Amino acid sequence: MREVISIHIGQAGIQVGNACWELYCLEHGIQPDGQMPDDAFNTFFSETGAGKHVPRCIFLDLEPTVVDEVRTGTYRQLFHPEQLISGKEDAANNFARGHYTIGKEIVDLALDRIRKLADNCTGLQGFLVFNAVGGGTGSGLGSLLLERLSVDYGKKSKLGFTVYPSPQVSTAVVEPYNSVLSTHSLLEHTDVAVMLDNEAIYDICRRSLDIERPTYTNLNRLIAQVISSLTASLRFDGALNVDITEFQTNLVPYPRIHFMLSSYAPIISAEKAYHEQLSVAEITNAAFEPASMMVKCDPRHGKYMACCLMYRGDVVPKDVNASVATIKTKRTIQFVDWCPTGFKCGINYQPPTVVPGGDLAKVQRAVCMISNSTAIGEIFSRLDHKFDLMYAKRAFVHWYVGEGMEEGEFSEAREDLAALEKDFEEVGAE
Amino acid sequence: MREIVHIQGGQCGNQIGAKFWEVVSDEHGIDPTGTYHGDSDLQLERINVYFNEATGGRYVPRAILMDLEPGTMDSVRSGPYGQIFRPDNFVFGQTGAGNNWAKGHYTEGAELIDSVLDVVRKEAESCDCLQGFQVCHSLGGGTGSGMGTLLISKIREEYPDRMMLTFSVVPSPKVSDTVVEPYNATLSVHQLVENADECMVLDNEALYDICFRTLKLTTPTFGDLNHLISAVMSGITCCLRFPGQLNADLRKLAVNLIPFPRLHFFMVGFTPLTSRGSQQYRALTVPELTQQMWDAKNMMCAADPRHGRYLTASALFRGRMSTKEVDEQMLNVQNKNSSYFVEWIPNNVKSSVCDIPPKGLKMSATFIGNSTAIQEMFKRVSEQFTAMFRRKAFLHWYTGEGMDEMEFTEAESNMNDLVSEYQQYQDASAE
Amino acid sequence: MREIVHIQGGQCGNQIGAKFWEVVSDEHGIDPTGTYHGDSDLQLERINVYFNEATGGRYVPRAILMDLEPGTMDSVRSGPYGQIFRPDNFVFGQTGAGNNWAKGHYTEGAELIDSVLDVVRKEAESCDCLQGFQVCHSLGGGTGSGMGTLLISKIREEYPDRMMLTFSVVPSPKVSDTVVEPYNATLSVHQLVENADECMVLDNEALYDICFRTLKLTTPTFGDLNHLISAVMSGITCCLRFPGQLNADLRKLAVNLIPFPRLHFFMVGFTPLTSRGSQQYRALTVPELTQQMWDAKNMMCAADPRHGRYLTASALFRGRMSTKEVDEQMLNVQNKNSSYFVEWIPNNVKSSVCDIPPKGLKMSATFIGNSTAIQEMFKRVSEQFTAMFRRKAFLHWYTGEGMDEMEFTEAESNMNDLVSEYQQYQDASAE
Amino acid sequence: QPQQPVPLAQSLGLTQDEVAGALSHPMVHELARSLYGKASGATS
Amino acid sequence: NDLAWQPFSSSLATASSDKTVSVWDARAGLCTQTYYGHQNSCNGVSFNILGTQLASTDADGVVKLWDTRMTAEVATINTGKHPANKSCFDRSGQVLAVACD
Ligand SMILES: Nc1nc2c(ncn2[C@@H]2O[C@H](COP(=O)(O)OP(=O)(O)OP(=O)(O)O)[C@@H](O)[C@H]2O)c(=O)[nH]1
Ligand SMILES: Nc1nc2c(ncn2[C@@H]2O[C@H](COP(=O)(O)OP(=O)(O)O)[C@@H](O)[C@H]2O)c(=O)[nH]1
Numbered sequence A: 001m002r003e004v005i006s007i008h009i010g011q012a013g014i015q016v017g018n019a020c021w022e023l024y025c026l027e028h029g030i031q032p033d034g035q036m037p038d039d040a041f042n043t044f045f046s047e048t049g050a051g052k053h054v055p056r057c058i059f060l061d062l063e064p065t066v067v068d069e070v071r072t073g074t075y076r077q078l079f080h081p082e083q084l085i086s087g088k089e090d091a092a093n094n095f096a097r098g099h100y101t102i103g104k105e106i107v108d109l110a111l112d113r114i115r116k117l118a119d120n121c122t123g124l125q126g127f128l129v130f131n132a133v134g135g136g137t138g139s140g141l142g143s144l145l146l147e148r149l150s151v152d153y154g155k156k157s158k159l160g161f162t163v164y165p166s167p168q169v170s171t172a173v174v175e176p177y178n179s180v181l182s183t184h185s186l187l188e189h190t191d192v193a194v195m196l197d198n199e200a201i202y203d204i205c206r207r208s209l210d211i212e213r214p215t216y217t218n219l220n221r222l223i224a225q226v227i228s229s230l231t232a233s234l235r236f237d238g239a240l241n242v243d244i245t246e247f248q249t250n251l252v253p254y255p256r257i258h259f260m261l262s263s264y265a266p267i268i269s270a271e272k273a274y275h276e277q278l279s280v281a282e283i284t285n286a287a288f289e290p291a292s293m294m295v296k297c298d299p300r301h302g303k304y305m306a307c308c309l310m311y312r313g314d315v316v317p318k319d320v321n322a323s324v325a326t327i328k329t330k331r332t333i334q335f336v337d338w339c340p341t342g343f344k345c346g347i348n349y350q351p352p353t354v355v356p357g358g359d360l361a362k363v364q365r366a367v368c369m370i371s372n373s374t375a376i377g378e379i380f381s382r383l384d385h386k387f388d389l390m391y392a393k394r395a396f397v398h399w400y401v402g403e404g405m406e407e408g409e410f411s412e413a414r415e416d417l418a419a420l421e422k423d424f425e426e427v428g429a430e
Numbered sequence B, C: 001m002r003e004i005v006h007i008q009g010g011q012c013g014n015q016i017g018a019k020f021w022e023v024v025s026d027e028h029g030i031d032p033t034g035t036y037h038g039d040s041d042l043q044l045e046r047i048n049v050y051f052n053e054a055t056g057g058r059y060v061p062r063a064i065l066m067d068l069e070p071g072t073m074d075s076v077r078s079g080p081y082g083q084i085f086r087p088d089n090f091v092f093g094q095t096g097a098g099n100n101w102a103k104g105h106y107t108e109g110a111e112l113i114d115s116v117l118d119v120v121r122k123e124a125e126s127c128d129c130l131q132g133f134q135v136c137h138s139l140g141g142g143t144g145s146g147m148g149t150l151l152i153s154k155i156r157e158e159y160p161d162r163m164m165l166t167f168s169v170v171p172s173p174k175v176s177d178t179v180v181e182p183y184n185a186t187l188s189v190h191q192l193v194e195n196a197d198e199c200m201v202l203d204n205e206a207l208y209d210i211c212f213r214t215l216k217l218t219t220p221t222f223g224d225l226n227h228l229i230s231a232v233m234s235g236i237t238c239c240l241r242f243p244g245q246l247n248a249d250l251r252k253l254a255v256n257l258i259p260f261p262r263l264h265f266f267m268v269g270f271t272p273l274t275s276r277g278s279q280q281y282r283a284l285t286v287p288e289l290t291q292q293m294w295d296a297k298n299m300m301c302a303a304d305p306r307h308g309r310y311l312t313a314s315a316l317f318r319g320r321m322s323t324k325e326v327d328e329q330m331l332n333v334q335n336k337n338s339s340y341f342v343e344w345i346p347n348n349v350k351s352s353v354c355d356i357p358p359k360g361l362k363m364s365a366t367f368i369g370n371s372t373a374i375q376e377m378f379k380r381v382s383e384q385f386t387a388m389f390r391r392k393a394f395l396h397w398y399t400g401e402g403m404d405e406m407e408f409t410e411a412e413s414n415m416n417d418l419v420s421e422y423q424q425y426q427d428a429s430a431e
Numbered sequence D: 001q002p003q004q005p006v007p008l009a010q011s012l013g014l015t016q017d018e019v020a021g022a023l024s025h026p027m028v029h030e031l032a033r034s035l036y037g038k039a040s041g042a043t044s
Numbered sequence E: 001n002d003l004a005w006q007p008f009s010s011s012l013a014t015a016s017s018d019k020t021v022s023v024w025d026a027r028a029g030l031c032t033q034t035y036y037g038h039q040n041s042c043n044g045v046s047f048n049i050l051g052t053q054l055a056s057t058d059a060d061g062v063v064k065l066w067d068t069r070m071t072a073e074v075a076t077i078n079t080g081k082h083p084a085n086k087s088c089f090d091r092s093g094q095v096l097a098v099a100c101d
């Protein structure tokens, strides 16, 4: 009745999907074999007559290795083999390769399976697209898939949990190129886009979890906890229920402005746990701390427009009200003049489940703050010069041209990102 | 399921390829008789990248051996892994090329190229999906350089979209083996520029320097140099054969490495190369691997990076390691050595991580650098080629094979233009 | 977690460093194989200040061993703790400097200094935080003085903020070993004044004095002098390695010791040095330690403090002791000997207390005194340098290495200026 | 180690399978991953 | 097959037998623009005296006038089936003179 279709595109999408689905299995009691020893799972799993539960997810990638890792690992009897879709040739960090030449047949099969999945859902809250902006598979194929979904499904709410390149640290070289292309693509298709940065999550792990060597598994576990907190109100009852449709209404002031900073709290290891009180006010403050942001974007530079807080566990409305009143009275936290309330508080009675093998402690309270703020334009500003610096020499441009793109596409993407910068400046200004 | 067609050309290329296949079979637990004896699922998981299954349990390399004289490939069959290769993939002439590029490319290479292409097509079609071809040979020799460049041209004609990778042993700066090395190298560079999508430059003298300074060997035979080259050639494609935390195939490496199509010559290195005495005296950490990797002594190319500027650099790490640790190491290297990195590219490092380290080594890292430093190597080869060509010494041997004199000057012009492009992007300023 | 990079230079420097590393390994419970065998947590708590962990439990010094002749470090490797050192940190040439500072600084030191700087930079970059470098060497020797001064200049250029500590074995006043000791010492002091942040001056004859008069030894070899120098070198930095009731790092010592930048030459001494016979008989108390340390005979510097005036003086005590007792003893020393202490500094004593005494000793205390007494030492070295330089004896050996005669005059002028500053602050009056 | 005026495996009844797969357990693998992540602070 | 500098500019327009007319930056060395309108070997190119338009001839007799900044085909005209060879813009004029076989 509250089904949500999960899409995981590219290596990063699949690797965060592994953590997400392990977390969902742990939360709902579903064993990795597929079945558990009501109907709260229906959002993420569809049950069969035999009692065995299959997730409503689709693992899309043009490379076979990542998907075969899932096919060989513990969750081989859980997922649908055809829902795991594997390509033959990788996109090789080429947006054109993933969007024009290789991605065609793969996206056709993906839409086929997505139709089959949506046909099994009475209701459909929306799509959760988890991809990696900065890679040919994630950016190009993901952009094509989002465009097709917008064309055919229509008004279904697509929430894109995208991972943009970090300000200074990165793993690719053409990452500004394909990131600009995919941002051009997804400015007009996704309904609410959640920004994530590897550098910011690395900093969170290093400072809060005391992990001197954070890794992709830790990053994915944090992202999985955040998405679980986001979807908790769909699956578990509690005071002040918040919905996928209500995210857009209480978070998106205008259709272009729908990019969101995400921050989880508390992030504490068990050795540091039960060593602080972890009250509602303190976890709210931690969630509003700039270091707790999962994007290398200081909110002090900009102004908050909206903030949806998702409380999990033993949280009382009096405490959320007191904490939010303190936040409003706080001076460093600054809101736009045209949004006096700017807050969407929603509580859930289900505490965040702890993944065995993870670093997170078993905490009875949690906050997931997803905020629309004009500061997010800074990351686009960074990519806008990282792009044009290479584009001046047309470096690596032959690679993108070879798979059927044009200089006009790069020009249009750069112009649209400049327009997005201007829109962020205009919404920030009085 | 992304197959690679390995081709060996010339005596040096054949020996290097044999050592490479020995190393790969050791990594995958394949005995010289073809049977798997590794006792590990991951070894057999992606064995089809390099090998094909026979009627029984035998696993055969997807290797094609090319030569004009049969002595070198007789030694190939006498080698430790001489029995894995199919006898049909040995393509041999009868009169070897007398270190003559013209002989190996026009007169004697023309006839045998029929069989070479027939075998290449037979091996390529049987592949489900083909990543591309990798050709190991030595610039500065008749059959290897000439015949290999002819094959590369033919394969580029047949499969334009498929990847082309070359491991060329460029003639060494100080000590040269044969007299006509500048001629053969100049002629082969002209072909590699136009045809080869991705090319690695190797030098026997650089290999001697690394094996005498880092490994501290006293009498390194050619087997040891082939061993180091084989380590690099395995490490470049370990991401296809093994699961990776952040995997990167050959095409991804080329995309992140090559800014412009003609600047596709790369200088490679392998870590950790540790002397036997100091094996207990080295602590295997990601910073130590990066410190050795960015050292100019570890480069297997004669040109040192300090003279030029790094256009791009890919680092494929293997082993249980932190993505944060690796990424921070490479960012810190860039920040510390911002002088040696090109300004108009915001990030000059393509970092990849694989979960399978080589046997025995807890961690490893292979480095593939596209830098303007190779300009000085091409400049030295030009300084030799022009000196010999002005007096036209040994030119009559290439002329008697039906090669026009204008072809030499065309090759020299192409190589000089490549030098000019390298200088242009070495001294190019942002904005 | 504040690391120190140790460097040994020349024959004397290498042997002193070997003895020092033996002492430090004994203090930290490190066997010659590097495994920890100490059975005390504080030993391993701050072992990273000097040692790095290998693949196993092995702990290796952060030491860099410099020379131009190989026999000295062949002996170093043959020594009791010869195999703890990283083999890569042994940088040696082929032909030694014939006691020629010119050879060790300009001709032969130029080639090897690049490798030395590479090793030093590799050791420094691995450090989490770097307190600084300590260079143990001997003024009055070719490779020692030359390479030490050159390396100190290079390290000062690369890491200006990081601390620099020197243990220079100044040539003895009365009995000189080699003829060109005045030349080497004069050329090295000029470099040390400009570059070295903190300098300890040591004399073989002063050590011989302490070993006949305090220690009452009979035929003490160089091992004993190196042992005492090692004791001082350990005790100066024991506050970094062990918890202290009032701890003080090298930078704190330098800040409290150096009133003006050029007056950074210090005399040092160790307590308690007693003979075997009176060991049962001597009272192990803070006043006894103070009485011994403030004695002129306890100094490892030839110059006696009675002639000069104490500009500053730091005392680092080791052992569970009363801070009141220490402070009262040293205040009493100042009040009693106010004639020997500079008037325009209200307190000329920097007291540091560490909670861990050296092994075997109930208590200890190391002394570092900045006094104008060293003026007479520099004056004597100038008296010899001028005597030779007037007739230009042996000057041609240095001139043939490509250094101007003008360098000798500049070094003499700088050294005389330092002497003049010492006299000025000896006879400066308050207000 | 003080003077004291039987095997750990024998104590607690650890089975041979547990001894063999001690480092092969997924929980122990996660513990090793956490220990490696906390470099030099693992013993804190 | 043909080469012509853009009037008073560092741009260079070259027409090749690959049915393409490509405009490059001489200093940078990169292809700023490319035109694929032709169906045969492009024998010649000519510029308007101001640089507004470029007339590129074709082996089949097609002469295509492209706009410099619009980067679009303004006027595709056909002479006889014989090749058009080389062309010339009128001096500050609206006329194009084309050769022919
Ligand atoms: N946060 C996070 N990011 C990841 C993770 N894995 C990969 N990424 C990011 O994902 C980007 C590339 O992902 P993909 O495009 O899917 O890589 P791929 O599957 O080989 O596809 P292509 O690279 O486009 O050929 C990299 O730039 C990484 O920054 C992960 O586990 N966590
Ligand atoms: N690394 C390596 N280099 C070799 C080996 N054998 C020959 N070479 C070098 O390869 C260069 C070219 O010889 P080669 O191409 O094999 O001659 P060809 O077979 O007639 O073309 C010579 O200068 C040799 O120094 C080998 O086994 N290993």
Ligand SMILES: Nc1nc2c(ncn2[C@@H]2O[C@H](COP(=O)(O)OP(=O)(O)O)[C@@H](O)[C@H]2O)c(=O)[nH]1
Pocket: C009, C010, C011, C012, C013, C015, C016, C096, C097, C099, C138, C139, C140, C141, C142, C143, C144, C145, C169, C177, C178, C204, C222, C223, C225, C226
């Ligand atoms: N304390 C001490 N002094 C030494 C030792 N070896 C040499 N010396 C003295 O140090 C002085 C300088 O010698 P040195 O610089 O080591 O010679 P070099 O290494 O060839 O330059 C000599 O005059 C010796 O008297 C030693 O082991 N201990």
